[PDB]
């Protein structure tokens, strides 16, 4: 009898990165909330030098 | 027309500076006073129309629509003050301001002597209606009803503007008083074919036309009572007024061009009446009846004879009043039983006698019982379409039977038979509801005494 | 970022755009474009996150390619004319190269690929600064070389930009991508009417700048980036929902709002030159922009989306942001129709 | 506002008003570790302003008239309801945890604003760097679900990265049996329902996850129960610390100015607490939120801004 | 592409079916080449063979649509002795739509393509008859 | 498990329970009575009775009476002098030029 | 005293109020003077005195 | 049959599904700079030779 | 025109089609940008010295200055990239696709 207002089902449609998903848009995660990504620190590869006997 | 625009605009400081619970009383009182002062537009002459200034003029065609709009606003405020009793005060003031703004745009639409100004107000009526439907409705599907109502109308009206601008580059002016003397015949060509389509399809969409009517059963049954009133009784007549204004420039190409739309409406009246014979919803039944009556008005305008024009405007006024009454009846039943099913609440004559009398009277005026103006308009359209061709009367006559096959049916399932056993919240009829139905019906019954004021600009 | 350095950089951006606007030499035009790009790069690098680095790299590559094409066309015009006056060109190849370079600088399709990604990867301040201020100098350069652009090329670019922006705006939930696709569609709308009467182009530019600034400033005030927070805004301040509702109704080209100001009169300039198919197609395509504007209004204002418990605390703290010129800008973007002949001052 | 970029340009630097005594101290411990008065002792020996532990009604005391709001307007959670039945079906536990964490974020923002604006150190109790430990106990006892942990981790990740750790953290080591004895001597009937396993898990996540990860970015001072009863040793140990670790060392005036710009905007601080992620514990429906908001608006002193309320006695409104 | 349209349009309608069909085939092949070039640009195929297969498929589909449209339009114009009539172009557009449905191996696509391309071809013939302009030279 | 913490749906309100003399306008009896009086006075005693009186006494609408009376003169002209009642040509044939054919 | 903390707008900013009133008065008198000289010079040019 | 399916199919649902399909096709790019600049080169190649925009 | 003009324009087009098709390396695109700048410089000074426009000899050198005003800038837009990822590949710059 009350006026209908949207629930989590109507509000969760817009929560994705895209509105109509496709096969290509399958791994598209949404952007972060603060748009700051983890640094994904790779191996820095310090060069190994042989200050040898000669 | 500045003596009617200014009080309508001043209604908003009335509804925003009012007390905590005195908004409805003040708005109803002052809108009824505006409706009383609206009768000064009856200064019509047998040859000359009433011209106020370079922007506003009132013929004998726009005057009944103006009077109907300014009469409908207090009835609208009376109708929409029961399901908004739990609403916020700011939201209530916003709703009243929306109704006032919509009425202002409506009374500025009909008096426009320029077709561009008329078109601008004709699209400016879209925004408050869409806002009302999508905000103060009850179901979910109103959101869908906010799309089909919108993107239909603009899809008809965005080409038409271009055609209107073309006239501004061709005839030198778009003033209706000038164009009555500077009009030119339209030769048969593909360019004039598509210009006719551009100038007409907006008014076929907003009337509506069968095939393009799909937005009307959706925007009538999710909308609130005030929205249902504004769609049924006024907003479907913008297409008819635009047709009557724009048919002057589209001659003589209309003689062979109007055939497919005439056939579409002549079959759509039968199709929509048959749909009304099997509808499970009261509101959808009233919507499809509105579609059928406006298809009849489309036929009347397209055959363009004086009797057809007279029947068209009489049918417009009568259908507006009758559809408003039927929608208020449906709203009262919906407020009492909290559902829209026709078969749910039966045998209401044993519980509400006066509402049964109002239902019987509204169904009587729906099937055009003489000498009501419904019968006057429908009869004159029938005479004109018999003059047009001798076979179309069959396509009229059968339709009449189907009308009497659903309206009384809409009576019986809601009024007669054994009452349902598990419904025991049937309250007695309020004074406000009975006042609403009497204010809807008594002008309609009184107009049968003097119908010469609603017989168009060529009476 | 130091406030002194930020003020100096913003003044450099303004000086570069002014140098493009007021100079009568092609080399000075290119110098102003280079200064504008160099001083607009670090604005997008304000927060030092990776997405800013991708956006800056893509923007820099596109702008460098556009500047190279612009200088090549300038050199070809010098070869074929022997002067430097900023006026009509004397080689169709130079005109084509300048039109391509200015289309890449304006982000017009099919050079529109960088616009939504750059707009999404940068903050709202840099996004507003880009999408409003950086679209002033190339429009002025297009205004100056009016008797030189090929009609077919610029009209094809305009209709392509309008169609591509209208199609791309439907499938987005981020607000910045929606604004970028809207900017592309409006770019096509301005360049559609440029060759007929550029006064309508200037009117459309002013109106589009006002509406885009209003929407971006409302996004600042509500601190929203996605559609869900914009929906959640109804719990904090409903006046903001009213303002974004009337603004998004304005940008849809719905009368009697000021967004009906350019487009209608744009049609008024295409029928005088016997072009009736193109304005009809352009309005039919702008219906898509109206569609996703209506979707945004349904999500934000006309429906009451669910909220969270923590918003209760936000009821105890009023907004203390510097909403500069927001009511004036909303009033200009909504109720400017009855002052329609004011555009006669733009001649 | 009062402090802006024009003020920083005109000469109002941040490091000029920051002396050596400006230190941020977070005193920590168990439920009844006795730190609640001990920190106050460190308030009255070093001359530092004391902030009590941020409860449900911290924001109610911060703004308005200072009186606590009703629970239906602020918090929508009860600590006693959690203490009676921690496995309640309405999700009271995670709602209380989220409200407490957001209140602690507000308290940390207020303390950082006071420290950066006045140069006087602030003494806190159980700041945002040591709240998740409580959450871990709620996960180890099965009081909440994994989605609550994921949402809390998302909120913490998007919020805590814009702030700074405290200079000194003090941990009061009290065993579980002594904590239970102090709780039984407290006399609060709702606190007697705390299980021994909950306090044991709190101690385990304090000693295993908080302190090993916290001692790199600041300096720890672990104290026993007997040593926390004498504040002279605590203040003497605080006054002779060689601050060399932590991100406070490499701070210019620009970084502190940006931190003060972000901190002094309270809605910017609480922007990411209410992320639109739909969880049964925290999601409030449309009609309930509408009713609560409309009832909150009509409260005295809350309808308009903090100086435009005629029902409380604010004058010269028409000239403001 | 200016010379291809001029080559197709200067041939009288319903006179030489083969040259008109060849011109329409060339127009369709050019449009399909543009479409396939953009497709292999933006969406990279996994191999060279897949890319050339997609290019050949798009070009053959568009060429078949254009060839059947031109042949059907010329056949209708010869059969009806109505060269300046858009209904022949409507028939050719529907034939091209049926060809598109056959190439896509579906019926609803064929029906929709028939309807929309028949309307588009009728509009193109209408504009050629009435002298409509799509890219209007500015005059005022 | 309790998705969507929500207030329960309130029951229907009967205006006759707290006030059996309710006209259906407002739950406050004085406001309801005054609204009823305003509606029944300005809806029936002002815009219907006086409105119908104004419409009934319209001063010669569309000169529909006058066109009769002038006709009552005009026939009495042309019947008196033997003229035909109506000519087949609306305009005088002497003042209109036809194209050559 | 009601609020537990001093609001930033508890007392009216008198210098801002004075600046606003002075700016409004100066703009009004400047517009009136400009209109008077404009209509006077228009009457002088066309001789419509 | 007619007013609930077919009239609801020919006009509104066809354009609705076409706009959905075109919106999915347009915005399905991978976000790579190399493909975008290759499309730029192909656009320049089309404009120079096939469309004769340099005349 | 002449012959060296044709060769310099051919060099510009060669460097343009070198730039527009990337090969998964940002430095190569920067080298292509420098090459197009050099070709434009050479064409401009060839035309200027042929036509004896002496007062425009300020043009090319000043033009050359603004080369660094992007080119060195490009290097400053690389080091953060090379701090975000271990290499400078252009396929790693695809985070802005959603
Ligand atoms: C609601 C759904 C249905 C909507 C139907 C709306 C109407 C259908 C027809 C509209 C045609 C477009 C407007 C035409 C205005 C013509 C004015 C004029 O002066 O014409 C003479 C002019 C004549 O050209 P001219 O005036 O420039 O030349 C001088 C005159 N001659 C030719 C003698 C030299 O006609 C035209 O310019 C062409 C008119 C046809 C245009 C065809 C393209 C549009 C096709 C229809 C698209 C409709 C929308 C579809 C999508 C809807 C949303 C989903
Ligand atoms: C117009 C468009 C908007 C529509 C909505 C309007 C809303 C606002 C409404 C305002 C008020 C109403 C305006 C219209 C008024 C129409 C009435 C009117 O004035 O008519 C003028 C007509 C005028 O008649 P007339 O034109 O013949 O007279 C010449 C004119 N005068 C009066 C100046 C001499 O009034 C009448 O006909 C009244 C006649 C006397 C009263 C009735 C007597 C008979 C009653 C019934 C007897 C029993 C019959 C059998 C019953 C069996 C059981 C059912
Ligand atoms: C024919 C050619 C016509 C040319 C006309 C030229 C007119 C003048 C130039 C207009 C162009 C835009 C100028 C402003 C660009 C954007 C400035 C900007 O983004 O400033 C940032 C600032 C941030 O404020 P804050 O919220 O404190 O900071 C958040 C943390 N970053 O502030 C904001 O984000 C808030 C917004 C501040 C500026 C709003 C007002 C100016 C822009 C809109 C135009 C208003 C109407 C006046 C001009 C009409 C014609 C365009
Ligand atoms: C149901 C959905 C909702 C409603 C939508 C609208 C429905 C009504 C409008 C469409 C009705 C069917 C089409 C119109 C039929 C009547 C007019 C017509 O086109 O007749 C066929 C015509 C006859 O030839 P004739 O009229 O002499 O042509 C020269 C004059 N220009 O034949 C010809 O000229 C030959 C064929 C010409 C091309 C026809 C097809 C394209 C143009 C129409 C679209
Ligand atoms: C012919 C035919 O076989 O149509 C069927 C086809 C679907 O084919 P399939 O389902 O594979 O068998 O169905 C289709 O191709 C789709 C429908 C074809 C066109 C129907 C046109 C009239 C539709 C009703 C209009 C009412 C107004
Ligand atoms: C819905 C969409 C409706 C579109 C309606 C388009 C109507 C046709 C407009 C173009 C056209 O055919 O114009 C006629 C013109 C022939 O006349 P003319 O200008 O003398 O050509 C000689 C060249 N100077 O023809 C020409 O100039 C050459 C042919 C142009 C064809 C343009 C459309 C091609 C097909 C779609 C892409
Ligand atoms: C006679 C007029 C015929 C055309 C009328 C206008 C199109 C049909 C009516 C509007 C759209 C109706 C609708 O609701 O479509 C739903 C569909 C998917 O939308 P979705 O977001 O999934 O649904 C939200 C849940 N209610 O939405 C869509 O697929 C979006 C389609 C938008 C089309 C807008 C009109 C474009 C016209 C120009 C095309 C070029
Ligand atoms: N995040 C939290 N979750 C549950 N209870 C808490 C939390 N933070 C503090 N408390 C309670 O606060 C009280 C400790 O305050 P105090 O006695 O002053 O040290 C104990 O009852 C704790 O259970």
From Swiss-Prot, chain B:
Its EC number is 7.1.1.2. It is a multi-pass membrane protein. It is found in: Mitochondrion inner membrane. GO terms for cellular component: mitochondrial inner membrane; respiratory chain complex I. It comes from the Eukaryota. Keywords: Electron transport, Membrane, Mitochondrion, Mitochondrion inner membrane, NAD, Respiratory chain, Translocase, Transmembrane, Transmembrane helix, Transport, Ubiquinone. The keyword NAD applies. It holds the Pfam family Oxidored_q5_N. It is an enzyme of class 7 (translocase). GO terms for biological process: electron transport coupled proton transport; mitochondrial electron transport, NADH to ubiquinone; mitochondrial respiratory chain complex I assembly. GO terms for molecular function: NADH dehydrogenase (ubiquinone) activity; ubiquinone binding. The chain crosses the membrane at residues 22-42, 60-80, 98-118, 147-167, 196-216, 224-244, 256-276, 284-303, 308-330, 351-371, 391-411. It catalyses: a ubiquinone + NADH + 5 H(+)(in) = a ubiquinol + NAD(+) + 4 H(+)(out). Core subunit of the mitochondrial membrane respiratory chain NADH dehydrogenase (Complex I) which catalyzes electron transfer from NADH through the respiratory chain, using ubiquinone as an electron acceptor. Essential for the catalytic activity and assembly of complex I. Belongs to the complex I subunit 4 family. Core subunit of respiratory chain NADH dehydrogenase (Complex I) which is composed of 45 different subunits. This is NADH-ubiquinone oxidoreductase chain 4. It comes from Ovis aries (Sheep). The lineage of its organism: Eukaryota, Metazoa, Chordata, Craniata, Vertebrata.
Curated annotation (Swiss-Prot), chain C:
One of its GO terms (cellular component) is respiratory chain complex I. It catalyses: a ubiquinone + NADH + 5 H(+)(in) = a ubiquinol + NAD(+) + 4 H(+)(out). GO terms for molecular function: NADH dehydrogenase (ubiquinone) activity. Keywords: Electron transport, Membrane, Mitochondrion, Mitochondrion inner membrane, NAD, Respiratory chain, Translocase, Transmembrane, Transmembrane helix, Transport, Ubiquinone. Belongs to the complex I subunit 2 family. Core subunit of the mitochondrial membrane respiratory chain NADH dehydrogenase (Complex I) which catalyzes electron transfer from NADH through the respiratory chain, using ubiquinone as an electron acceptor. Essential for the catalytic activity and assembly of complex I. This is NADH-ubiquinone oxidoreductase chain 2. The lineage of its organism: Eukaryota, Metazoa, Chordata, Craniata, Vertebrata. The gene is MT-ND2.
Curated annotation (Swiss-Prot), chain H:
It comes from the Eukaryota. The chain crosses the membrane at residues 31-51. It is found in: Mitochondrion inner membrane. Core subunit of the mitochondrial membrane respiratory chain NADH dehydrogenase (Complex I) which catalyzes electron transfer from NADH through the respiratory chain, using ubiquinone as an electron acceptor. Essential for the catalytic activity and assembly of complex I. Belongs to the complex I subunit 5 family. Core subunit of respiratory chain NADH dehydrogenase (Complex I) which is composed of 45 different subunits. This is NADH-ubiquinone oxidoreductase chain 5. It comes from Ovis aries (Sheep). The gene is MT-ND5. The chain holds residues 552 to 606 of 606 of the full protein.
UniProtKB/Swiss-Prot annotation, chain I:
GO terms for molecular function: NADH dehydrogenase (ubiquinone) activity. It is found in: Mitochondrion inner membrane. One of its GO terms (biological process) is ATP synthesis coupled electron transport. It is a multi-pass membrane protein. InterPro entries: NADH_UbQ_OxRdtase_chain4L/K, NUOK/Mnh_C1-like. One of its GO terms (cellular component) is respiratory chain complex I. Keywords: Electron transport, Membrane, Mitochondrion, Mitochondrion inner membrane, NAD, Respiratory chain, Translocase, Transmembrane, Transmembrane helix, Transport, Ubiquinone. Its EC number is 7.1.1.2. It is an enzyme of class 7 (translocase). Its main location: mitochondrion. It comes from the Eukaryota. The chain crosses the membrane at residues 1-21, 29-49, 61-81. It catalyses: a ubiquinone + NADH + 5 H(+)(in) = a ubiquinol + NAD(+) + 4 H(+)(out). Pfam families: Oxidored_q2. Belongs to the complex I subunit 4L family. Core subunit of the mitochondrial membrane respiratory chain NADH dehydrogenase (Complex I) which catalyzes electron transfer from NADH through the respiratory chain, using ubiquinone as an electron acceptor. Part of the enzyme membrane arm which is embedded in the lipid bilayer and involved in proton translocation. Core subunit of respiratory chain NADH dehydrogenase (Complex I) which is composed of 45 different subunits. This is NADH-ubiquinone oxidoreductase chain 4L.
């Amino acid at each position: 009898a009350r006026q209908w207002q949207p629930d989590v089902e109507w509000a969760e449609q817009y929560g994705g990165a895209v509105m109509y998903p496709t096969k290509e848009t399958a791994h598209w995660k949404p952007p972060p909330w603060n748009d700051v990504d983890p640094p994904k620190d790779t191996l820095v590869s310090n060069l190994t030098l042989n200050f040898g006997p000669q | 027309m500045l003596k009617y625009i200014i009080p309508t605009m001043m209604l908003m400081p009335l509804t925003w500076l009012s007390k905590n619970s005195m908004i409805w009383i003040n708005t109803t009182l002052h809108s009824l006073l505006i409706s009383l002062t609206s009768l000064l537009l009856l200064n019509q002459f047998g040859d000359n129309s009433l011209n106020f200034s370079l922007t506003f003029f009132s013929d004998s065609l726009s005057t009944p629509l103006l009077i109907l709009t300014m009469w409908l606003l207090p009835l609208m405020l009376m109708a929409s003050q029961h399901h908004l009793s739990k609403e916020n005060l700011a939201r209530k003031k916003l709703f009243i301001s929306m109704l006032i703004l919509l009425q202002l745009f409506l009374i500025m639409t009909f008096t426009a002597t320029e077709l561009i100004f008329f078109y601008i107000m004709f699209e400016a009526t879209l925004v408050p209606t869409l806002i009302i439907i999508t905000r103060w409705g009850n179901q979910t599907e109103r959101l869908n009803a906010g799309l089909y109502f919108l993107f239909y109308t603009l899809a008809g009206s965005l080409p038409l503007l271009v055609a209107l601008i073309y006239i501004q580059n061709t005839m030198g002016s778009l003033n209706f008083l000038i164009l009555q003397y500077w009009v030119q015949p339209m030769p048969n060509s593909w360019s004039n074919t598509f210009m006719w389509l551009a100038c007409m399809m907006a008014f076929m969409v907003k009337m509506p036309l069968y095939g393009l009517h799909l937005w009307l059963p959706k925007a009538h049954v999710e909308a609130p009572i005030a929205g249902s009133m504004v769609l049924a009784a006024i907003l479907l007549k913008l297409g008819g007024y635009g047709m009557m204004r724009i048919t002057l420039l589209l001659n003589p190409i209309t003689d062979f061009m109007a055939y497919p739309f005439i056939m579409l409406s002549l079959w759509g009246m039968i199709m929509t009446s048959s749909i009304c014979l099997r509808q499970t919803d009261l509101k959808s039944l009233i919507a499809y009846s509105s579609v059928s009556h406006m298809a009849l008005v489309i036929v009347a305008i397209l055959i363009q004879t004086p009797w057809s024009y007279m029947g068209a405007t009489a049918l417009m006024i009568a259908h507006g009043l009758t559809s408003s009454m039927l929608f208020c009846l449906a709203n009262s039943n919906y407020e009492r039983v909290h559902s829209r099913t026709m078969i749910l609440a039966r045998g209401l004559q044993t519980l509400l006698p006066l509402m049964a009398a109002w239902w019987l009277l509204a169904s009587l005026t729906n099937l055009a019982l003489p000498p009501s103006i419904n019968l006057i308009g429908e009869l004159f359209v029938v005479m004109s379409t018999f003059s047009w061709s001798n076979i179309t009367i069959i396509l009229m006559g059968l339709n009449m039977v189907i009308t009497a096959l659903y309206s009384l049916y809409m009576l019986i399932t809601t009024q007669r038979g054994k009452h349902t056993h598990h419904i025991n919240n049937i309250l007695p009829s309020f004074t406000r509801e009975n006042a609403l139905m009497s204010l809807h019906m008594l002008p309609l019954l009184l107009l049968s005494l003097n119908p010469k004021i609603i017989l168009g600009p060529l009476y | 970022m130091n406030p002194i350095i930020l003020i100096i950089i913003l003044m450099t951006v303004m000086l570069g755009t002014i140098i493009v606007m007021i100079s009568t030499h092609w080399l000075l035009i290119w110098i102003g474009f280079e200064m504008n790009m160099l001083a607009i790069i670090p604005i997008m690098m304000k927060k030092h996150n990776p997405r800013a680095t991708e956006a800056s790299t893509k923007y820099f590559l596109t702008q460098s390619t556009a500047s190279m094409l612009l200088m090549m066309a300038i050199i070809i015009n010098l070869m074929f004319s022997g002067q430097w006056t900023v006026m009509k060109l004397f080689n169709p190849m130079a005109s084509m190269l300048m039109t391509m370079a200015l289309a890449m600088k304006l982000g017009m399709a099919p050079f529109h690929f960088w616009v939504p990604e750059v707009t999404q990867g940068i903050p709202l301040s840099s996004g507003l600064i880009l999408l409003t201020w950086q679209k002033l100098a190339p429009m002025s350069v297009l205004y100056q070389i009016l008797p030189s652009i090929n009609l077919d090329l610029i009209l094809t670019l305009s209709i392509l930009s309008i169609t591509i922006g209208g199609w791309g705006g439907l499938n987005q939930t981020q607000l910045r991508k929606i604004m970028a696709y809207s900017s592309i569609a409006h770019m096509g709308w301005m360049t559609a009417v440029l060759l007929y009467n550029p006064t309508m182009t200037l009117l459309n530019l002013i109106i589009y700048i006002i509406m885009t600034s209003t929407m971006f400033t409302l996004f600042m005030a509500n601190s929203t980036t996605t559609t869900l927070s914009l929906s959640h805004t109804w719990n904090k301040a409903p006046i903001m929902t009213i303002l974004v509702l009337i603004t998004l109704l304005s940008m849809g080209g719905l009368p009697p709002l000021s967004g009906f100001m350019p487009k209608w009169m744009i049609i008024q300039e295409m029928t005088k030159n016997d072009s009736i198919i193109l304005p009809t197609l352009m309005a039919i395509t702008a219906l898509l922009n109206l569609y996703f504007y209506m979707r945004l209004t349904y999500s934000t204002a006309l429906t009451m989306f669910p909220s969270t418990n923590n918003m209760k605390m936000k009821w105890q703290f009023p907004t203390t942001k510097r909403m500069t010129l927001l009511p004036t800008m909303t009033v200009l973007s909504t109720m400017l129709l009855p002052l329609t002949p004011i555009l006669s001052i733009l001649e | 506002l009062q402090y802006g970029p024009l003020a920083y340009i005109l000469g109002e630097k941040t490091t000029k008003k920051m002396t050596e005594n400006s230190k941020l101290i977070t005193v920590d411990g168990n439920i009844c570790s006795g730190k609640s008065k001990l920190a106050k002792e460190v308030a009255e020996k070093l001359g530092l302003k004391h902030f009590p532990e941020a409860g449900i009604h911290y924001a109610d005391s911060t703004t308005g008239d200072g009186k606590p709001l009703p629970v239906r307007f602020s918090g929508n959670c009860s600590l006693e309801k959690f203490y009676d039945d921690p496995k309640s079906n309405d999700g009271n536990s995670y709602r209380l945890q989220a409200w407490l964490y957001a209140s602690r974020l507000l308290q940390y923002a207020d303390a950082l604003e006071h420290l950066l604006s006045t140069g006087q150190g602030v003494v806190l109790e159980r700041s945002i760097y040591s709240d998740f430990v409580f959450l871990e106990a709620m996960y180890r006892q099965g009081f909440i679900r994994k989605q609550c942990v994921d949402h809390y981790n998302q909120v913490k990740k998007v919020t805590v990265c814009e702030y700074l750790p405290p200079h000194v953290v003090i941990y009061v080591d009290v065993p579980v049996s002594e904590v239970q004895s102090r709780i039984q001597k407290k006399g609060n009937p709702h606190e007697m329902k705390i299980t021994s396993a909950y306090l044991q898990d709190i101690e385990n996540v304090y000693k295993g996850t908080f302190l090993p990860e916290m001692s790199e970015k600041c300096e720890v001072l672990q104290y026993s129960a007997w040593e926390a009863e004498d504040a002279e040793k605590v203040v003497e140990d605080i006054q002779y610390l060689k601050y060399d670790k932590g991100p406070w060392l490499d701070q210019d005036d620009r970084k502190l100015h940006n931190l003060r710009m972000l901190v002094q905007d309270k809605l910017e601080v609480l922007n990411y607490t209410s992320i639109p992620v739909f969880l049964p514990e925290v999601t409030i429906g449309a009609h309930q939120s509408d009713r609560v908001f409309q009832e909150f608006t009509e409260l005295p002193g809350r309808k308009y801004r903090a100086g435009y309320n005629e029902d409380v006695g604010d004058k010269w409104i028409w000239l403001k | 592409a200016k010379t291809l349209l001029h080559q197709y349009w200067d041939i009288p309608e319903g006179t030489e079916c083969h040259r008109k069909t060849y011109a329409a085939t060339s127009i369709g092949g050019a449009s399909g080449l543009v479409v396939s070039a953009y497709s292999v640009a933006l969406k990279t195929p996994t191999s060279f063979l897949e890319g050339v297969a997609r290019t050949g498929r798009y070009t053959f589909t568009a060429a078949a649509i254009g060839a059947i449209f031109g042949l059907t339009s010329c056949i209708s114009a010869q059969v009806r002795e109505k060269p300046d009539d858009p209904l022949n172009y409507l028939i050719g557009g529907c034939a091209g739509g049926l060809t598109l449905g056959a190439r896509t191996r579906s019926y609803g696509i064929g029906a929709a393509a028939c309807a929309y391309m028949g309307l588009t071809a009728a509009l193109v013939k209408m504009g050629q008859l009435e002298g409509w302009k799509v890219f209007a030279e500015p005059k005022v | 498990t309790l998705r969507w913490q929500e207030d329960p749906e309130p029951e229907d309100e009967n205006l006759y329970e707290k006030n059996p003399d309710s006209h259906g306008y407002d739950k406050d009896p004085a406001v309801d009575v005054w609204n009823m009086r305003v509606v029944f006075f300005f809806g029936f005693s002002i815009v219907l009775v006086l409105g119908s009186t104004f419409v009934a006494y319209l001063p010669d609408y569309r000169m529909q009476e006058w066109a009769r009376r002038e006709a009552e003169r005009l026939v009495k002209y042309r019947e008196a002098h033997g003229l035909p009642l109506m000519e087949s040509n609306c305009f005088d044939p002497s003042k209109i030029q036809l194209p050559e054919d | 005293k009601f609020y537990i903390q001093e609001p930033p707008h508890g007392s009216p900013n008198w210098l801002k109020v004075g600046l606003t009133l002075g700016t409004s008065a100066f703009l009004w008198i400047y517009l009136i003077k400009q209109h008077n000289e404009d209509v006077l010079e228009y009457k002088r040019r066309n001789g419509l005195e | 049959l007619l007013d609930l399916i077919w009239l609801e199919t020919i006009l509104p649902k066809t354009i609705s599904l076409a706009q959905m399909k075109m919106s999915t096709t347009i915005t399905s790019q991978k976000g790579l700079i190399k493909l975008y600049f290759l499309s730029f080169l192909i656009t320049i190649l089309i404009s120079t030779t096939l469309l004769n925009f340099h005349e | 025109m002449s012959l060296v003009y044709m060769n310099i324009m051919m060099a510009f087009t060669v460097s343009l089609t070198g730039l527009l098709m990337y090969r998964s390396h940002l430095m190569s695109s920067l080298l292509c940008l420098e090459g197009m700048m050099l070709s434009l410089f050479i064409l401009a000074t060839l035309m200027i010295l042929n036509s004896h426009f002496t007062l425009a000899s300020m043009m090319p050198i000043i033009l050359l200055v603004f080369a660094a005003c992007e080119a060195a800038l490009g290097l400053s837009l690389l080091v953060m990239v090379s701090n975000t990822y271990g290499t400078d590949y252009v396929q790693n710059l695809n985070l802005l696709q959603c």
